[PDB]
Amino acid sequence: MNIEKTRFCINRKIAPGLSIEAFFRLVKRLEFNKVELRNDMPSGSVTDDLNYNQVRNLAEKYGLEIVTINAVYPFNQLTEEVVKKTEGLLRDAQGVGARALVLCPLNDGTIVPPEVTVEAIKRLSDLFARYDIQGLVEPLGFRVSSLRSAVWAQQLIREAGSPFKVLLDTFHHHLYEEAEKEFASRIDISAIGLVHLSGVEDTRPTEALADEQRIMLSEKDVMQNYQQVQRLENMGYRGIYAFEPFSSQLASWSEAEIEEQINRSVSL
Ligand SMILES: [Zn+2]
């Protein structure tokens, strides 16, 4: 297996400690060219205390692409409150020159009918076009997720007639029983426009693991990061990979610890 390095993205959630400057100067210095900004770090702001300029220039200086902002939730349950909140994020992404905003389904045990997610996808595609932002729909694995399958979400994006793509997240994939030898032919790598990697070394049962159980990559993470990435490659994927580990263990890691466990990960 070989994959081109320039194809690697560093999701900020990996670095809750660092300021954006701090976070940027890192990456670049750590090699690569793509990041993800997020609206769920301590600041609660895609820019922390900054403004669009400061950030934008900070991406220029370190020659980085802001690939996505995570995330809009619940994109699916698209009340006027949610619409106003989404608009926020589009202003953010347009503001920092992000290319995508990440869309997360309702994740609370409530059914969101396919017809409604299909409407929410129509309405968000208008609203995105309005800010010239791309969309990425991230199915969530959990039994309580109102959209679990990357296949189904492609089905529903095709139906809304949307240029949006799916965000394949290794954990959420892992966490969803009916894919792998039901995936493969059913899935369409054309329309996967981002892949979020994170590893789960933990011996617990899959059937109720969480965002907290996500460290980085290395031999015996019970998630098939290689075997997913092997297949994604086998299949045509020439798009981005991003490290989006969550877990409280991203709490150690000097600016130099993060530097290395990114490299454990990139096993090749
Ligand atoms: Zn993700």
Q: What is the DSSP string of 142-194?
A: STT-S---HHHHHHHHHHHT---EEEEEHHHHHT-SS-SSSSSSS--GGGEEE
Binding residues for Zn(2+): 138, 169, 196, 244
Give the separation between CA 66 and CA 11, rounded to whole angstroms: 10
* Resolution (Å) of this entry: 2.6
The second-level CATH assignment, the architecture, of 1-268 is Alpha-Beta Barrel (3.20)
Cα(225) to centroid(ligand 1), Å: 14
CB of 102 closer than 8 Å to CB of 68: yes
Cα(220) to centroid(ligand 1), Å: 20
Cα(55) to centroid(ligand 1), Å: 22
Give the separation between CA 198 and CA 247, rounded to whole angstroms: 10
Cα(128) to centroid(ligand 1), Å: 20
H or E segment and range at residue 231: helix 225-235
Cα(168) to centroid(ligand 1), Å: 7
Give the separation between CA 11 and CA 34, rounded to whole angstroms: 9
Give the separation between CA 2 and CA 87, rounded to whole angstroms: 39
